[PDB]
Amino acid sequence: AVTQSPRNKVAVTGGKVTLSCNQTNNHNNMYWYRQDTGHGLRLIHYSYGAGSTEKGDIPDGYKASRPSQENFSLILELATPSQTSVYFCASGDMGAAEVFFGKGTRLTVVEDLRNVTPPKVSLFEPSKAEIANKQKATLVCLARGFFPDHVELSWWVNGKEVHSGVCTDPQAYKESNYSYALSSRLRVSATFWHNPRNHFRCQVQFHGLSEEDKWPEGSPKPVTQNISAEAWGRAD
Amino acid sequence: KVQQSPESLIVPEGAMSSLNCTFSNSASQSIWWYQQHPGKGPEALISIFSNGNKKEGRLTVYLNRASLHVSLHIRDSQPSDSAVYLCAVSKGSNYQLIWGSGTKLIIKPDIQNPEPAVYQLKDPRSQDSTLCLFTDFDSQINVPKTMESGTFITDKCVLDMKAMDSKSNGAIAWSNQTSFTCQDIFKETNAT
C-alpha cells in the first residue's frame, strides 16, 4: 500500500539521510513517525496534501517536503546518534480515522562506519540425547558479532522457507558494545532428521552499507548480504 | 497522553493476553488498536467508539469514558498474534491520533509435558564450538543471564507458526572458555 526507502540505513554523524515514503493510494495526508522504546510512535511532521508540509511533535533535526501528494520525504540534514531509530510512514484521509502504514526504515547513526560488520552465523546440529531420548531434534542457529542489528533470520529446509517449529529470539542481544547476538531454534522429527537427504540452512540477512558509501579498509565492505550455515541430516 | 498496561507481555500458546490503555480527554471520540507484526508497520486491528464491549473474533475491547481505560483482550492467544500493540485515540475526525506507549506481546511455546533437558549441541562446520540448549522447561521458570563476563544465557524464545505440536522451545547458553560445564551454577530458577 505504502512504501518507504531505504528500508535500512547506516549513517555517520553528519549525513544526508533522506527517507522517502510513497503512498500509491490516493491519500491526502502523509505522516512521518518514529518508534523508540517507551514510545509507540511520535510524529515528526506531516503534509496535508501536495504542497505544504506543516510541523509535528518532534521536528528537530528533521525537515520534510511534499513534492508529490504520492511522495513525502523526511530529511535529517545533519545526522546525530539520537536519530538512531525505526521510522514509519503513514498515509491518511478523511474517509476514516484509520491510517495506512509503511513497513519501516531502520536507521542507525554511528561515529565510525568501520564498526559495521556482518554476522558470524553458526548452525549447531541436534543432540544425540535429544534425538534418542525425546524423538525430536532441535537444530540451533546463532549469529554473533554483527553490527548494526538490521537483520532478519530465516530457516530454509530443503530450499523452502519454513516457519512451523521455528522459534526465534524477539530482540537481538547486545553481546558487546557493538557485537549483537541472535539465536533461533528449529525443532523437527528424529525420523525426519535422520533422512540423509533433508537439508537445513539457517540464513541471516544483514543490512550494512549502501554501495554509495566509502570503505577504504584492509577488509571487504559490509554491504547488505545473506550469510548462512547449512547442515544435512545424518544417521549417527 | 496515552499509556499502555505492560511494556512487555509474554504468554504461553493458550493464554488470555490482556493489554490496557489510558487516555486523558474523557470525551475522546474514538480508540483504535493497531497491531505491528515483525516486518510490518501498525495495521489497524480494532475500534471502540461507544462505552461497553465489542467482540470481534477472539478479541474483545472495553472502554469506559468515565474510567479513561480501554482494554484489549485476546482469548486463545496464538503464535500468530504476537506483535507490537499500539493504542491510538482519535478524539475527533478533525484531530490526528494521539499514540500510546505500546506493548510488546509475545507468545511463548506452551510446554504441556514439561520434560526439561540441558542438552549440549556441537558446531558441525568444525571448531571446538559447542553450546547448551535448555529445552522443554516449564511455563514458570524465569531466566536472567549468566555468572561472568564470558558467558551468555538467552531468555525464552518466541514462536512463529500457527500449527504443529513440535514447536521448538528453549533457552540457550554459550561460554568463551572450554572450562565451564554445560550445567553450571545457573543464575536462574531451576527444577528437575
Author numbering:
A (entry chain B): 1 to 236
B (entry chain A): 3 to 194
Sentences from the paper on this structure:
MHC class I-related protein 1 (MR1) is a metabolite-presenting molecule that restricts MR1-reactive T cells including mucosal-associated invariant T (MAIT) cells. Recent reports have, in addition, identified non-canonical TRAV1neg MR1-reactive T cells that do not express the TCR or markers characteristic of MAIT cells. The most frequent clone in Bcl11bΔiThy mice accounted for 15% of total αβ T cells and expressed a Trav7-6-Traj33/Trbv13-2-Trbj1-1 TCR (designated as clonotype #1) with identical CDR3α and CDR3β sequences.
Cells expressing clonotype #1 occupied 87% of all Traj33+ T cells in Bcl11bΔiThy mice. Furthermore, the TCRα and β chains of clonotype #1 preferentially paired with each other. Crystal structure of MAIT TCR-MR1-6-FP ternary complex is superposed onto clone #1 TCRαβ heterodimer. We thus reconstituted the expression of clonotype #1 TCRα (Trav7-6-Traj33) and TCRβ (Trbv13-2-Trbj1-1) in a TCRαβ-deficient reporter cell line. As predicted from its TCR sequence, clonotype #1 did not react with an authentic MAIT cell antigen, 5-OP-RU. These results suggest that non-canonical MR1-reactive T cells recognize metabolites presented by MR1 that are distinct from MAIT cell antigens.
